[PDB]
Structure formats: structure tokens, C-alpha cells
Design a binder for this molecule. Structure first.
Ligand SMILES: Nc1nc2c(ncn2C[C@@H](CO)OCP(=O)(O)O)c(=O)[nH]1
Ligand SMILES: Nc1nc2c(ncn2C[C@@H](CO)OCP(=O)(O)O)c(=O)[nH]1
Ligand SMILES: Nc1nc2c(ncn2C[C@@H](CO)OCP(=O)(O)O)c(=O)[nH]1
Ligand SMILES: Nc1nc2c(ncn2C[C@@H](CO)OCP(=O)(O)O)c(=O)[nH]1
Lengths: 212, 211, 212, 211
């Protein structure tokens, strides 16, 4: 059971001054955990891992849409580049499950719940950007399985190494990270950090500056 | 007002053998109108234009339209990085599906995706293609419903087809001949998602991937 | 005999305001002939065209180095991405032929002429960015053939549609362009335009501003 | 002074199965030190650093070194685009080849590539890797010969090896363990050019691609 690229507690970040970061976030971050390009190369591998398990068949790519879908979009770009070479053209269904608004994350409020029965009898790939406690995903899996898919696998860019974890482990994991609050790449903080390319740890002045 | 990059009816696009195209689509396309990289370069200029005119809320039209939206917003993020202050960008989503009608003439739209973040904001409607202009018109009256500070439409593609005469698009990537196109952001019954270029579907393609 | 992507006299450019161009070149260009991304997609195809003819064997990639090697670098990046999939790893020799300093371009002055006999018995791919009269290339071919390669093919990004052409046609051509003086992408004018992504036509104020 | 991104001897790099690696190199590598995208992000910062310190002439070390040079200059071009005035950038080239010496201890360098554009200019020496530091030292005394206004060394890689003690590099991408690396910019007898990541060669790789 590969936990992905492990970012240790004892290593962890890169120094902020080692990478290009927008000047308006100078004081808003602690460390860079995962540079943009590292995310990309790992995602390229995830796509290949996904195709070994699910390739050659239709498959339904389902984005867990909360703040954004940047990871979904990049994973799909890589999966699509792998599909190019196949002798037969393989159809690909792209869908989003939108979840509405972090201490009761297990309670899901789905907004777009139309023709959920399109999942029935289908090979479903659920794509998440971050798993923390894992409560959201385990309840989302309860919903999805009631529609009887042929197969359900979950890919998550990030899994947080927390005691608060309920023990849910995704089938595909990009990176296993320390138990710190991260922003950037695909993760916004109240609509900020959208322009930050790298997964980084928010600072306390960032937390205070950008609060809702 | 630009009409955008005008692709003429006279010698439209490029021969298939001049660009890289998945081997499984060899019989399925007629010509390539817009190679991927050309889409990207024009989208970069579109992002620049959007920032000129337009707090902004960017509206993605769900399912179809994540692709062009993602790229357009990527370029907008690239311009945003240099600002003195980190300036908030809201992304909103609506689901919109169209169905053919074999009777009458009446149009079928099903809207499914909450729009509480639209009042007093500058709204950008992002579309993939304008043909009849009914999707645009539907998106407009739905946004006008929440009383926006500003409303603009950006669309990667506009077909040279006769239409009623709604509100011409503000930001246009490409003005293209009246052909049915697939690739980049446009699928055909879930096929062509792996095709990066905007190309005209062939009759072999239509019958092979029909549904 | 495919002349590449033909850019007509009657179409030709795109309007400058249709693309992103650095502000310091605002007044220095007439039209954009080939946007950066178009160059890339055509180059991707060239790489595949090259591998159909020369693939599966070592091959020596020889850059005609004058001002720069941007086209060489991008073509090789694409050729290398095609080599990734092969069952056997295929060695690739990368070399440069440097030509020293446009009315007697047929006279070549080669600077780096060391172990030119490495070309002997080898499959050689000569890479050029622009052909105008074609005199440079035909004399360069005279030199190269004297070292007895197994095969010589020439790829050029651009071929200019000029009456001044001596009739040399490359084996691989990206684009056939009108008879206008172009800069950008790989083409500098006295060290300017290095930062311009697109192949564009220099204006008269650009010509005057940036002259040697 | 940065030493750059420090890759430690303690748990160095990543397992091969965590990144995409050409199938033909499956037996030929030990571990991956630096995935391609990580190289690119750091190079972007290096380009920013170069522009801080440094008219500039950028010196490519021919054959080996076109790759890292091209990427470093790409990022420098990206920063340059925004300037109020188009600022000239000179690129220069020298050929440099090293040969093993099985006797003595004496070093073999062959220099082959004209350097008239160096007097009174800021010169940037661009290298791929510093191990012994003899290439750097050779490039230095050759550039000092033409009396530059400024001289700087940028190198993507610096090995944690004992060396004489020349002029430590000014711009360093990565400080890496004392292992023999291939990929990205470094070949092994013409192999690994299609490998995008910096990785340690295996004993199977060494014997298979030996020469
Ligand atoms: N941006 C960001 N968000 C987080 C983080 N940790 C938990 N969350 C919140 C949610 C993500 O929706 O974690 C979900 P769960 O796995 O706790 O149910 C974090 O580090 N960064
Ligand atoms: N793939 C593809 N789809 C299209 C095309 N033209 C119209 N459509 C469909 C609708 C969008 O659902 O056109 C938008 P409009 O007719 O509502 O303006 C087309 O050429 N290719
Ligand atoms: N930048 C640029 N250079 C050019 C051009 N036309 C001829 N040249 C000069 C040379 C290129 O070295 O043409 C060589 P030949 O084919 O005339 O020998 C041009 O349009 N742009
Ligand atoms: N591919 C590869 N090559 C290397 C390496 N270490 C030294 N070299 C060779 C020379 C450059 O020719 O090292 C530079 P220096 O020893 O002169 O500083 C290495 O790890 N990989």
C-alpha cells in the first residue's frame, strides 16, 4: 500500500527563497511543501497508475468540486495524453460532484445531484485534491455506492498524516504530507492563493489577512 | 469589439497531415481549424483583455466547459501574480444541458448547478462555442436575475451562422466557418476529449461515435 | 513534396492586437505570421515525420548554430518524447555546427570544426531555423557530404517563398512563408527580439531602432 | 550565497515507481534525485536571481550544456518581456570536452568553440554539474582572459564531494549527494537524453550503456 511521495516531519518544506512565489504572498506562507513542477511529475505518474487499473474501458471521471478543480483538470490532461496512443478511441465521461460548505466535514451537502444514476454500472474515478480527516470522502463513498457503480476508485493529490484521520486511504495518492494547513496549486483560502503555483503552508499573518 | 481571429470560409484551417492527431481519429476528421498551441496563445491575449475591462466572479458552465475555463483562468492567474496586493478571484459554477427537439422549433435547456455570489459583482460568462446563441442568451437572463455590477461574455469560438441577434460576445477567441467542430473543449458523445486541436468532424466520425 | 504549412501572400499575418506581444516591441513589428503555440504543434508533427524516416537508429542531430538554437532545442525535446516509448533505448548524438557572419550567404565560415569525421557512416539530421536563398544550406551540404554520412536529411522551421531561392528544398519544412523579413521565436535581429515568442515581420522603425 | 536546494545523504530523492520513467530505463537507475518539474521551478528562481545581480553575455558550454542553458534562458526571456525597453541579451558559445586520464593525475581539457563578445561585459558561465570543479576553473581562467566587467557561475548541480577549493558557484540549483547522475541535461555515452529527471545510474545501466 504505497502512501505516495512521503514528505516527512523531519524534512518537510523547502525554504521560501528557493522558489518563485508572488510578492503579495511574501509574508503569508511558512514553507513550500510541493513545488508546482513536482506536483505535475507526480500527477503524470498517477495518470499512468490510473490507466493500469482502469484503462481500455470508458470510465467516468468524477471531480469532487468544492473550491476548484485544478488537480482534476491536470490529472485529466495527463490521462487524456495517455489515451492518444490507444488503437481504439476510448470514450471518457467527465463529471463534477459539487459539495457545499471543517469540524463536521462528514456531513455532505451535494448541490449538483442530477442523473446520479449515470454512475450505475460504470467504472468511476473519484478525484479529490486533499484528504484530511477523511470523513467527507467516506460519506461521499456511501452516496456513490448506493447507485451501484461497476467500480469505484479514489485519487487524491494530498493525504494529510493526522491522528484526526478516520483511516480512509485512497487508491491513488500523490503526496502524504505533515499535519499542517496548506494552500496553493489547487487549494484556496477564502478565494486567496488561487495564483500560488505551489502547495505551501499558510502562515498566521496569512491566516489573519485572508480570513472570511 | 474584436470579432477575434477570423478563420475564413476561403481555404479554412489546415490539412490533417500537418499536425499531430491521435491515430484512432485518422478517418474521423475533415480538417483542423485551430491547433492547440494557437488556442493557447489567443487565450493568453483574451485573459489580458478580460483584465482590462474587469471585483470579478468567473462563471464556468458545468460539464462541457471546464477545459477552456481552466486555461483562461490559468492565464488570468499568471497576470494576477505580479499585483501589489493579492486580489480575490471568485469562481462560480452552473450546470447547463441542451437537448435536441425533433418537433416544433422550441429550445430545451436544463439548468442544474446555486448562485449566491453574483450580486454587485462583475460577472464573466465563459462559453466554448456560440452557434445559435441560445446558451449565451440563457446564461445572460439567468445572470441578470441576480443583478450584477457588470456582465460580459467570453467565448473561445463563434460560428459564422445566422442567428436572432442577441448580445454579441465581448471576448471572442476565434470566428470560424459554419462547420461542426470537435476537439480541445468540444466532445462528440464523449469522444475527442483526447484531441487537443479544434477540427471538423467527418461523416465517418459522426457515424462511428453517434451514440 | 509537402511545402509545410503554407502561409499565403493573400492571408499571411494575424493582427498584432490579437496576440500577447511584449510592450517594448509595440511599434517594432508589422504582423504576426506564426504564434508560438502554432510553431510548437507543427514542430511536434515534424518530430514524428523525422522519426518515421530516421527512427529506431542512433542518428546525429546537428544544429546549424548562428544566432541561437531555440528551434533545435524544441524539435529535440519533441523527438526525445517520442523516443521514451521505444522498447530499446536509442542513443542520440547532439552536435552543433557554428557558422560565423547576407548577400554572399553561400560563403560559410565554420568555427567549431572538431572531429567532423564523427559524421562518417552516420544518420545525420541537420536542423536549420530559416532558409531564404538557400545558399548557406547547399554549401553546408557540400561540406557534410565530403565526410560521407550514411544519410543526410535537413529540417528547417521556415522556408521563404523567394524568387531569390536557388531551389534547395529541405526534407522537412515547418512553414512556407511570404518573402518578408521575420524575427521572433528563434530569430534575433542584432540580439533583439530574443524575448518575442512569435514569428513576426519586423517593421521599418524596428529595423532602424535595432540596427547594428 | 545559497548552497541551493539541498538534497541530503539521508533518504536521498525518491523511489523509481513514484515518477514516470521510460520503460527502457527500468533496470538502469537506482533512485530519482530531481524530477523534471522540480528542476524547472528552481531554474525559474535561478533566472530571477541572475537578473538581480546582473549588459549581460550568457555563455553556453557546447555540446553537453545546451539543455539547461536553453531552459535557464527561457525563464530569463520571460522576465525580460515586461521591461520598458527591449534590453539586448548576447548568447556566446564555447566547446569544452573532458577526457579521462588513466595515468598521473593530470586533467585533460580540449577547448574548441571564438570569444570576441566578452570584453567589458557581464559574463554568466552556465554549467550543468560541479564535481571536481575543474570545468568551472577552466571556464573561469578562459573568461578572465578577455577582461570581463563581471564574472558569475551558474550551475544546476553541485555534488557534495571534496575538491581543491576554487571559486564556489554563485547560482546553484541543487546540492546533491556524491553519486553519478544522468538525465535531464546529463547523458551516459549518448543514452538518457530522453530521461527528463535527474537520477542515479545503476550498475546495470553503466554496463549496458558503457561505450
Ligand atoms: N486548503 C486546505 N483545506 C483543508 C486542509 N485540511 C483540511 N482541509 C479541509 C477539507 C478539504 O475540503 O478536508 C476534508 P476532510 O478529509 O477533513 O473531510 C488543508 O490543509 N488545506
Ligand atoms: N461539439 C460541438 N458542439 C456544438 C457545435 N455547435 C453548436 N454546438 C452545441 C451548442 C453548445 O451545446 O452550441 C451553443 P448555442 O447553439 O447554444 O450557441 C459544434 O460545432 N461542435
Ligand atoms: N532573421 C531573419 N534572417 C533572415 C531572413 N531572411 C534571410 N535571413 C538570413 C539568412 C539566415 O541565416 O538566410 C540564409 P540563406 O538561406 O539566404 O543562405 C529573415 O527573414 N529573418
Ligand atoms: N553525467 C554526469 N557527468 C558527471 C557527473 N559528475 C561529473 N561529471 C562530468 C564532469 C563534466 O564533464 O564534471 C564536471 P567537473 O568534475 O569538471 O566539475 C555526473 O554525476 N554525471
Amino acid at each position: 500500500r504505497s502512501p505516495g511521495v512521503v514528505i516527512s516531519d523531519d524534512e518537510p518544506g523547502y525554504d521560501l527563497d528557493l522558489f518563485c512565489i508572488p510578492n503579495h504572498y511574501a509574508e503569508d506562507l511558512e514553507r513550500v511543501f510541493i513545488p508546482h513542477g513536482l506536483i505535475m511529475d507526480r500527477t503524470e505518474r498517477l495518470a499512468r497508475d490510473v490507466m493500469k487499473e482502469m484503462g481500455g474501458h470508458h470510465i467516468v471521471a468524477l471531480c469532487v468540486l468544492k473550491g476548484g478543480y485544478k488537480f482534476f483538470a491536470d490529472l485529466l490532461d495527463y490521462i487524456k495524453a495517455l489515451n492518444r496512443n490507444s488503437d481504439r478511441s476510448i470514450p471518457m465521461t467527465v463529471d463534477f460532484i459539487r459539495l457545499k460548505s471543517d469540524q463536521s466535514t462528514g456531513d455532505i451537502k451535494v448541490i449538483g445531484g442530477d442523473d446520479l444514476s449515470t454512475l450505475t454500472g460504470k467504472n468511476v474515478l473519484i478525484v479529490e485534491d486533499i484528504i484530511d480527516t477523511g470523513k467527507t470522502m467516506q460519506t461521499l463513498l456511501s452516496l456513490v455506492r448506493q447507485y451501484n457503480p461497476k467500480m469505484v476508485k479514489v485519487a487524491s493529490l494530498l493525504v494529510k498524516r493526522t491522528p484526526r484521520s478516520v483511516g480512509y486511504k485512497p487508491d491513488f495518492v500523490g503526496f502524504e504530507i505533515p499535519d499542517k494547513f496548506v494552500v496553493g496549486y489547487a487549494l484556496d483560502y477564502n478565494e486567496y492563493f488561487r495564483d500560488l503555483n505551489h502547495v505551501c503552508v499558510i502562515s498566521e499573518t496569512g491566516k489573519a489577512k485572508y480570513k472570511a
